Design a protein around this ligand. Structure first.
Ligand SMILES: [Mg+2]
Ligand SMILES: [Mg+2]
Ligand SMILES: [Mg+2]
Ligand SMILES: [Mg+2]
Ligand SMILES: [Mg+2]
Ligand SMILES: [Mg+2]
Ligand SMILES: [Mg+2]
Ligand SMILES: [Mg+2]
Ligand SMILES: [Mg+2]
Ligand SMILES: [Mg+2]
Ligand SMILES: [Mg+2]
Ligand SMILES: [Mg+2]
Ligand SMILES: [Mg+2]
Ligand SMILES: [Mg+2]
Ligand SMILES: [Mg+2]
Ligand SMILES: [Mg+2]
Ligand SMILES: [Mg+2]
Ligand SMILES: [Mg+2]
Ligand SMILES: [Mg+2]
Ligand SMILES: [Mg+2]
Ligand SMILES: [Mg+2]
Ligand SMILES: [Mg+2]
Ligand SMILES: [Mg+2]
Ligand SMILES: [Mg+2]
Ligand SMILES: [Mg+2]
Ligand SMILES: [Mg+2]
Ligand SMILES: [Mg+2]
Ligand SMILES: [Mg+2]
Ligand SMILES: [Mg+2]
Ligand SMILES: [Mg+2]
Ligand SMILES: [Mg+2]
Ligand SMILES: [Mg+2]
Ligand SMILES: [Mg+2]
Ligand SMILES: [Mg+2]
Ligand SMILES: [Mg+2]
Ligand SMILES: [Mg+2]
Ligand SMILES: [Mg+2]
Ligand SMILES: [Mg+2]
Ligand SMILES: [Mg+2]
Ligand SMILES: [Mg+2]
Ligand SMILES: [Mg+2]
Ligand SMILES: [Mg+2]
Ligand SMILES: [Mg+2]
Ligand SMILES: [Mg+2]
Ligand SMILES: [Mg+2]
Ligand SMILES: [Mg+2]
Ligand SMILES: [Mg+2]
Ligand SMILES: [Mg+2]
Ligand SMILES: [Mg+2]
Ligand SMILES: [Mg+2]
Ligand SMILES: [Mg+2]
Ligand SMILES: [Mg+2]
Ligand SMILES: [Mg+2]
Ligand SMILES: [Mg+2]
Ligand SMILES: [Mg+2]
Ligand SMILES: [Mg+2]
Ligand SMILES: [Mg+2]
Ligand SMILES: [Mg+2]
Ligand SMILES: [Mg+2]
Ligand SMILES: [Mg+2]
Ligand SMILES: [Mg+2]
Ligand SMILES: [Mg+2]
Ligand SMILES: [Mg+2]
Ligand SMILES: [Mg+2]
Ligand SMILES: [Mg+2]
Ligand SMILES: [Mg+2]
Ligand SMILES: [Mg+2]
Ligand SMILES: [Mg+2]
Ligand SMILES: [Mg+2]
Ligand SMILES: [Mg+2]
Ligand SMILES: [Mg+2]
Ligand SMILES: [Mg+2]
Ligand SMILES: [Mg+2]
Ligand SMILES: [Mg+2]
Ligand SMILES: [Mg+2]
Ligand SMILES: [Mg+2]
Ligand SMILES: [Mg+2]
Ligand SMILES: [Mg+2]
Ligand SMILES: [Mg+2]
Ligand SMILES: [Mg+2]
Ligand SMILES: [Mg+2]
Ligand SMILES: [Mg+2]
Ligand SMILES: [Mg+2]
Ligand SMILES: [Mg+2]
Ligand SMILES: [Mg+2]
Ligand SMILES: [Mg+2]
Ligand SMILES: [Mg+2]
Ligand SMILES: [Mg+2]
Ligand SMILES: [Mg+2]
Ligand SMILES: [Mg+2]
Ligand SMILES: [Mg+2]
Ligand SMILES: [Mg+2]
Ligand SMILES: [Mg+2]
Ligand SMILES: [Mg+2]
Ligand SMILES: [Mg+2]
Ligand SMILES: [Mg+2]
Ligand SMILES: [Mg+2]
Ligand SMILES: [Mg+2]
Ligand SMILES: [Zn+2]
Lengths: 208, 124, 138, 83, 99
RNA sequence: GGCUAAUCCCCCAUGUGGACCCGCCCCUUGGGGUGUGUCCAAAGGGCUUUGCCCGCUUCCGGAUGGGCCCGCGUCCCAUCAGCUAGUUGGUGGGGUAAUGGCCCACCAAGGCGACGACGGGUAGCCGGUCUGAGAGGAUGGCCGGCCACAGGGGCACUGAGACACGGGCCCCACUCCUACGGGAGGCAGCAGUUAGGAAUCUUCCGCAAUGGGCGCAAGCCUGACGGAGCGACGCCGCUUGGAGGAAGAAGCCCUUCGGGGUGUAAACUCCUGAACCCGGGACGAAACCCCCGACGAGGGGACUGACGGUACCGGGGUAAUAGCGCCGGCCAACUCCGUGCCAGCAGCCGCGGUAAUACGGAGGGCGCGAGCGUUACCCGGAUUCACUGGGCGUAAAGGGCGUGUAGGCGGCCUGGGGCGUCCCAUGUGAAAGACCACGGCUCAACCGUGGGGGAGCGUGGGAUACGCUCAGGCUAGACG
RNA sequence: AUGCGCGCUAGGUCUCUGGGUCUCCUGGGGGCCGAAGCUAACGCGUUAAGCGCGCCGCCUGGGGAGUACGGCCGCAAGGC
């Protein structure tokens, strides 16, 4: 039961655009226009100098709220990363990016990540020929991700895919809008993602 | 100390002393009020603090704080000892748990309900 | 009677260098010589020679320093910053090959005495033997 | 006497048996002599059975006694063929 | 292998039996200094050969009595009476250290 | 008291062999061979009864499982310093499967102790587990291994095996039955009751699976087990929607009355479809058994479910739980009101006596979210018992001083040995766990298969610098 | 308010007591300033509180308390 409640408010508190809505976070309605300041009575007052703790906290919260996942899953995923051979920050970002819901967002099946979660949970999404309804499913390289045979009819899906004409997908992915499918090519590099998050600052957050 | 000296004697492990023989090891303990009264705290503060003398299921006798705004505890009531002190009182090593046995949860407290043991209010 | 002639030699070197002496006399022995040879090859000392002081054998050790420095305290850097006995009489440390420690990320050395002779850490690993861990130097 | 039987190693509704030489008086999941095989009744993988005949033959030769089910497995593995 | 130990005979005082003193060395498990412990063993000397102050070999054997699990295998060196001496003095020092 | 069968008991026989005394040989603790003398065997049943099955006896070996023995490791108190009479050893004997003061007789006078004996306190031990950068500290529930006990205590019988949880004898306590003489009992088995307690479950289903006992088999038994039930107790997955939606409704809060906040949040629009109904519906199951073959090998064939009509698949299909702690510093989150050293808070410093970001409520905010807090306990931080890794002139801490015992430590040169030390090989380090890889349940938790690692110890081989040791030598220490 | 021993690390100055070719130098003592260094600071500094090695003693927040109990010693006081 992750955060469910107003999203553009986190857009506001973190002081940066993180697109939880997809569309309209593109338009000048995001509230980041006209309210770049954090939420609440005091949000328009002068900021104090953030403690080291504060900085690292909020950085981690940025990274987390981006992917919509719970702190339990986030932390567990982090520890998983810190075990694995190779640089933690990158590896972490790579395991985050391999969440089926995420991959679905990334492929352009769903306007936002939350919507991608719902499409997954409702089984509109298949991996490697079989339906997968778990947002937390980890897509390994080579796995094909498609809109399910039946769900192809859905006006939402035909919509998004129609909007995905001519748009290019991530370089670690591939998309065929014809069969409404696409392949997860390889684990995305830090450089591959545009994320406004210093991850070595999140690493430092669990170091406490 | 020289190494030979440690071989001979060796460092000594430091024993820990229980701040709470509520004991029988337990997390909580049932008990019966003997006195219910007030006391005057230590030097820097002033107030009437509410406490109770309790006989215990451990066969122990201790002074306990009665945290909250209002309190219904009487002489013969049965009660649950929490443990943890009240710093500006004397030898009060335990708190009484509100909401269980004869100690009812604080009347009309909206904010921290779990401490003080009151259920959720009603909405219009 | 020195109670630990090796510790004594190392210490003499330490004191010597700390006042920037050009050289220092330690009472001579084979083992001390082997330790020296290792230093000299490693570059911590310029070298050493055998000499008779009061008709007694001594090893004269020629120390080595940095270039003169600037600002207040022109005194040059030490080539031997750190010289330390590890195994002492009264606690003798012996390491297997898997336990021969890397010193200062390689910038330093450890000297071991082994049944292949007195080696450095690198020497011992490459030779695949352990032994008594004599001292750290860096 | 020493026997050749199945020990249950799986999880709930997930039976996985080790084919095992053990004293009959031992409990089935307890310390055994040596594991000669494994058996996966739900056949979830390409190899759902394995044996290492030479061992099972040895044990049979010093007098181990197969459970008729372990016997069946062994036979399927070909412990018993002669020609 | 039947255990073999090496000791000095500190006691002649019994019939067909000698008390054999066996030192042992090892690194202290924490502090690391090499420390030397010791143990007295009752060993079986049927032919009454082995005298006081003998360094002998002891071997693990079928139990002869309660407390005698070892036999005297061979005489390694004869006439170490100083070892015995240290033993006797260590014993004698017990006479102090009470009241 | 009397009748009676047997694979029940016993006697003579056959001696493959075996046991015992004595002699001899080889091995060397009572191992193996051999000779004479002596001593010891058997059980019958079923069949299609001319041949086979199930069994029985003696012996040798195998396998498995145990007994006993030794080295080493195994908590606190020295305000426990001396302990010991079968005590320590010997000869002979008894006893057992077997060594043994295990037990008895006789003889000797020994044995243990500051390297902590004896005493007291506490405690099942381990694989592992928690924590920790590590060393270390702490722990030993569940699962696997070992031990011990079966109301307390003693004891033996039966047996291959027991000093025997659901076997026996005795004593003690307790409950019950009693014709007052006397008897019966033993959940630390499953489930259940009760008491104690802060607290711990169903008097369920099933023999279908794995395993166990007996039976030639058919089969019977199995509260081991495989399941289901109850408890957010733990872990993991999942949901309470998704997209659009105001230069931004109302209400509520702040207001310097200009406005600011809750906030795209809601309404609303559209879309998806947890729950739910219908349909289909398992894997776990193949042997035992039947046929051919010779009851074999091989080949073939059929019966077999608690979980369960569950999981799952297909069709239909409703916008559909959110709470809990905090917001003075440590520490992420601030304002208004009420209260006025009160009421209260409180982990520490501290806050409350009229502007309280610290009490109480409200708005708002931060953190987590089917949970969130609290108490208790363990490691942590704490380098605060310091091996890694601390100290002692004045902060705690040099003994009033010496003499010296045990012990610890030891100059230069050479040689022997190789105990420490190091290296190689090798055995051991079960499984589980931890690690790595690949895989199986849609994922994960969970699980499978594989690989690796690993201190320690056993055996064999090698090295010799250092430490030890033995032998020799020197004079710089030391003494004369 | 500074355990014992050993080796090592500038000098200056006053002094006690030996030796020397006796301004001075060379031992062994007592003091004072001060190199390097050390130290929380004060200070220490070849008479180390510096650099090292060996062995012994001792410490582990303040009080309660050098108290209580025990034991050993003592004629007692009282000591450990
Ligand atoms: Mg990593
Ligand atoms: Mg969601
Ligand atoms: Mg790529
Ligand atoms: Mg930490
Ligand atoms: Mg009491
Ligand atoms: Mg010079
Ligand atoms: Mg080793
Ligand atoms: Mg068994
Ligand atoms: Mg065969
Ligand atoms: Mg004798
Ligand atoms: Mg005997
Ligand atoms: Mg012999
Ligand atoms: Mg005595
Ligand atoms: Mg009769
Ligand atoms: Mg009769
Ligand atoms: Mg008759
Ligand atoms: Mg018979
Ligand atoms: Mg006969
Ligand atoms: Mg014959
Ligand atoms: Mg055997
Ligand atoms: Mg006392
Ligand atoms: Mg007696
Ligand atoms: Mg018997
Ligand atoms: Mg005997
Ligand atoms: Mg000893
Ligand atoms: Mg106990
Ligand atoms: Mg760990
Ligand atoms: Mg333990
Ligand atoms: Mg267990
Ligand atoms: Mg008992
Ligand atoms: Mg009884
Ligand atoms: Mg009993
Ligand atoms: Mg028993
Ligand atoms: Mg029973
Ligand atoms: Mg009760
Ligand atoms: Mg249950
Ligand atoms: Mg069954
Ligand atoms: Mg069965
Ligand atoms: Mg049978
Ligand atoms: Mg069960
Ligand atoms: Mg929406
Ligand atoms: Mg407004
Ligand atoms: Mg619809
Ligand atoms: Mg089947
Ligand atoms: Mg089936
Ligand atoms: Mg036939
Ligand atoms: Mg067949
Ligand atoms: Mg359906
Ligand atoms: Mg549908
Ligand atoms: Mg709604
Ligand atoms: Mg803050
Ligand atoms: Mg509070
Ligand atoms: Mg007011
Ligand atoms: Mg006010
Ligand atoms: Mg004020
Ligand atoms: Mg406030
Ligand atoms: Mg506060
Ligand atoms: Mg408040
Ligand atoms: Mg709120
Ligand atoms: Mg969860
Ligand atoms: Mg520590
Ligand atoms: Mg630490
Ligand atoms: Mg402490
Ligand atoms: Mg230390
Ligand atoms: Mg260590
Ligand atoms: Mg300290
Ligand atoms: Mg003194
Ligand atoms: Mg000595
Ligand atoms: Mg030496
Ligand atoms: Mg050797
Ligand atoms: Mg090995
Ligand atoms: Mg393993
Ligand atoms: Mg494994
Ligand atoms: Mg660990
Ligand atoms: Mg998988
Ligand atoms: Mg596992
Ligand atoms: Mg060897
Ligand atoms: Mg040699
Ligand atoms: Mg030599
Ligand atoms: Mg020595
Ligand atoms: Mg000599
Ligand atoms: Mg002092
Ligand atoms: Mg003093
Ligand atoms: Mg000192
Ligand atoms: Mg002077
Ligand atoms: Mg003169
Ligand atoms: Mg002087
Ligand atoms: Mg200075
Ligand atoms: Mg200074
Ligand atoms: Mg000075
Ligand atoms: Mg000096
Ligand atoms: Mg000098
Ligand atoms: Mg000194
Ligand atoms: Mg100091
Ligand atoms: Mg205190
Ligand atoms: Mg006094
Ligand atoms: Mg007296
Ligand atoms: Mg006095
Ligand atoms: Zn936005």
């Amino acid at each position: 039961g992750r955060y469910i409640g107003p999203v553009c408010r986190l857009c506001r508190r973190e002081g940066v655009k993180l697109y939880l809505k997809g569309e309209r976070c593109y338009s000048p309605k995001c509230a980041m226009e006209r309210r770049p300041y954090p939420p609440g009575q005091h949000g328009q007052k002068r900021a104090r100098r953030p403690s080291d703790y504060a900085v690292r906290l909020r950085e981690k919260q940025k990274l987390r709220r981006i992917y919509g996942i719970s702190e339990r899953q986030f932390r567990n995923l982090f520890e998983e990363a810190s075990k694995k051979k190779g640089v933690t920050g990158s590896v972490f970002l790579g395991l985050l990016e391999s969440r089926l819901d995420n991959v679905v967002y990334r492929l352009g099946f769903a306007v936002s990540r939350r919507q991608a979660r719902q499409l997954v949970r409702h089984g509109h999404i298949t991996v490697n020929g079989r339906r997968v309804d778990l947002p937390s499913y980890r897509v390994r390289p080579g796995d094909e991700i498609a809109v399910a045979e039946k769900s192809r009819n859905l006006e939402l899906i035909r919509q998004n895919l129609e909007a995905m004409k001519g748009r290019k997908v991530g370089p670690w992915l591939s998309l065929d809008v014809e069969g409404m499918k696409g392949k997860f090519l390889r684990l995305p590099d830090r450089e591959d993602l545009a994320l406004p998050v210093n991850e070595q600052l999140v690493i430092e957050f669990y170091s406490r | 100390p020289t190494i030979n000296q440690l071989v001979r004697k060796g460092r000594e492990k430091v024993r820990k002393k229980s701040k709470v023989p509520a004991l029988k090891g337990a997390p909580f303990r049932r008990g019966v009020c003997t006195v219910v009264r007030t006391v005057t705290p230590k030097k820097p503060n002033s107030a009437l603090r509410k406490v109770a003398k309790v006989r215990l299921t451990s066969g122990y006798e201790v002074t306990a704080y009665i945290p909250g705004e209002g309190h219904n505890l009487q002489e013969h009531s049965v009660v649950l000892i929490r443990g943890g002190r009240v710093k500006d009182l004397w030898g009060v090593r335990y708190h009484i748990v509100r909401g269980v046995y004869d100690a009812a949860g604080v009347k009309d407290r909206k904010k921290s309900r779990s401490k003080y043991g009151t259920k959720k209010p009603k909405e219009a | 009677m020195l109670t630990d002639p090796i510790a004594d030699m190392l210490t003499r070197i330490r004191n010597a260098t700390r006042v920037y002496k050009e050289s220092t006399d330690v009472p001579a022995s084979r083992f001390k010589e082997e330790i020296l040879r290792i230093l000299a090859r490693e570059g911590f000392i310029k070298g050493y020679e055998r000499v008779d002081v009061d008709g007694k054998p001594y090893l004269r050790v020629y120390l080595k320093y940095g270039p003169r420095r600037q600002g207040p305290d022109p005194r040059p850097e030490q080539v031997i910053h750190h010289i330390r006995r590890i195994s002492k009489p009264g606690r003798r440390v012996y390491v297997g090959v898997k336990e021969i420690p890397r010193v200062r990320r390689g910038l330093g050395i450890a000297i071991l005495s082994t049944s292949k002779g007195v080696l450095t850490d690198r020497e011992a690993r490459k030779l695949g033997v352990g032994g008594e861990l004599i001292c750290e130097v860096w | 006497m020493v026997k050749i039987r199945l020990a249950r190693f799986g999880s709930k509704h997930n039976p996985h048996y080790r084919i095992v030489v053990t004293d009959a008086r031992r409990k089935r999941d307890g310390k055994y002599i040596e594991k000669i095989g494994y058996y996966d009744p739900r056949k979830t993988t390409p190899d759902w059975l394995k044996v290492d005949v030479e061992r099972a033959r040895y044990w049979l030769s010093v007098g181990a006694q197969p459970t008729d089910t372990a016997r069946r497995l062994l036979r399927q593995a070909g412990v018993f063929r002669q020609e | 292998p039947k255990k073999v130990l090496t000791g000095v005979v500190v006691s002649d005082k019994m019939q067909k039996t000698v008390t054999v003193l066996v030192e042992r060395q090892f690194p202290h498990p924490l502090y690391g200094k090499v420390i030397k412990r010791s143990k007295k063993y009752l060993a079986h000397d049927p032919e009454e050969k082995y005298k006081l102050g003998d360094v002998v070999e002891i071997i693990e054997s079928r139990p002869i009595s309660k407390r005698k699990r070892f036999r005297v295998l061979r005489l390694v060196e004869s006439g170490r009476m100083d070892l015995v001496e240290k033993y006797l003095i260590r014993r004698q020092n017990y006479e102090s250290l009470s009241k």
